[PDB]
From a paper:
Human endonuclease VIII-like 1 (hNEIL1) is a bifunctional DNA glycosylase of the Fpg/Nei family, which catalyzes the removal of damaged bases and subsequent incision of the newly generated abasic sites. Unlike traditional enzymes which are commonly referred to as highly specific biocatalysts, one special feature for hNEIL1 is its unique capability to recognize a wide range of substrates, including formamidopyrimidines, hydantoin lesions, oxidized, and dihydro-modified pyrimidine bases, derived from all four canonical bases. Here, by integrating structural, computational, and biochemical investigations, we show that hNEIL1 uses a triage mechanism to achieve broad specificity and reduce futile repair of normal bases. This mechanism involves two mutually competing interaction states: an activated state that commits catalysis and BER, and a quarantine state that temporarily separates and prevents the flipped base from catalysis via auto-inhibition.
To rule out the possibility that the observed interaction is caused by mutations introduced to hNEIL1 for crystallization experiments, we used an orthogonal approach in which a modified nucleobase substrate is bound by the native protein containing the wild type active site. We synthesized a 2′-fluoro-substituted stable mimic of DHU (FDHU), which allows binding but not catalysis by hNEIL1. Indeed, in the hNEIL1(R242)-FDHU structure, residues R242 and Y244 again swaps positions, recapitulating the observed 244-in conformation in the hNEIL1(R242)-DHU and hNEIL1(R242)-DHT structures. Apparently, the hydrogen bond interaction between residue 242 of hNEIL1 and the substrate which is present in the 242-in conformation is absent in the 244-in structures, indicating the loss of a key stabilizing factor of binding and catalysis. Thus, the 244-in conformation is incompetent of glycosylase activity and hence represents a distinct interaction mode with potentially special function. In contrast to the 242-in conformation, the 244-in conformation is catalytically inactive and functionally protects the nucleobase from cleavage, in competition with the activated state.
Author numbering: 2 to 202, 222 to 290
Write the structure that this text describes.
DNA sequence: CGTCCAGTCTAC
DNA sequence: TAGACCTGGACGG
């Protein structure tokens, strides 16, 4: 998942947990190489926020919840399959690697981090990854400045399609958004990144880095996702103009990732 | 049955 | 850089 999916997953946790109270421990699957969450409360609320391709849960005990516990923050990266679901406690999906359990009164639910391929990670401590740039969705001006002020970096020597995956400058952009953004401006994907960015130093490339992903969020649904039904998933495939679409070209970048585009591949093409 | 395809992370 | 980390669906024989 990319920035829109991290964002929608955060909105899901906030809306679906608004009136839920969790209790007990935070349970990790035995196969998961991620750390155990040292947290226990008779009564805590779960809330979320997204920044780029990371999501932060806050575990907030209620007044007088036992054991005495301070709020705990967990930050998640989703890799290729990460996901959050609210399921009935005894109908855990396969690959539910981390689980928060509702307290009574009510139907016993589990909020689960579900990750088929286990590329996802969480760290104890609530901090965003050092080095990740501002969120293209929620910190646009900070995102735009962090790019324009550092065009000297060797990161911008590379093809624009490669630079757009560097989470130090485009936190929240992944393989589908880089195709959709470049297609909107018909920028050849193997144009040099510094060449296309220097001008800014009729929406430009950095505006689209915000507004294109915002469109996926505004579809509602769960972006490149089905944790909302088939309706929302087909809604997303219909929004796509370029990623995977018939009559589009594709090449491998230097990291073996597929870039979709129309027309001129650009000068630094392999 | 088999191949091929779908975001970091780190050891060369 | 390239291979590693994973599972599963879509396809081909």
């Amino acid at each position: 998942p990319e920035g829109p999916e991290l964002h929608l997953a955060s909105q899901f946790v906030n809306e679906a947990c608004r009136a839920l109270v969790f209790g007990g421990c935070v349970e990790k699957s035995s196969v998961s190489r991620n750390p155990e969450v040292p947290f226990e409360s008779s009564a805590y609320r779960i809330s979320a926020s997204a920044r780029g391709k990371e999501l932060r849960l806050i575990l907030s005990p209620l007044p007088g919840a036992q054991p005495q516990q301070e709020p705990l923050a967990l930050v998640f990266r989703f890799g290729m399959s990460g996901s959050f679901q609210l399921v009935p406690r005894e109908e855990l999906p396969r690959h539910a690697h981390l689980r928060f359990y509702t307290a009574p009164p009510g139907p016993r639910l589990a909020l689960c981090f579900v990750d088929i391929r286990r590329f996802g990670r969480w760290d104890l401590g609530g901090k965003w990854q050092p080095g990740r740039g501002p969120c293209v969705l929620q910190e646009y001006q900070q995102f735009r400045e962090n790019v324009l002020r550092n065009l000297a970096d060797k990161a911008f020597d590379r093809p624009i399609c490669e630079a757009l995956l560097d989470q130090r400058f485009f936190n929240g952009i992944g393989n589908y958004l880089r195709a959709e953004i470049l297609y909107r401006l018909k920028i050849p994907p193997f144009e040099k990144a510094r060449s296309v960015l220097e001008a800014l130093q009729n929406p430009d490339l950095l505006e689209l880095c915000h507004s294109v992903p915002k469109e996926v969020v505004q579809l509602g649904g769960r972006g490149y996702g089905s944790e909302s039904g088939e309706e929302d998933f087909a809604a997303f495939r219909a929004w796509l103009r370029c990623y995977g679409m018939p009559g589009m070209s594709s090449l491998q970048d230097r990291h073996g990732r597929t870039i979709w585009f129309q027309g001129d591949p650009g000068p630094l093409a392999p």
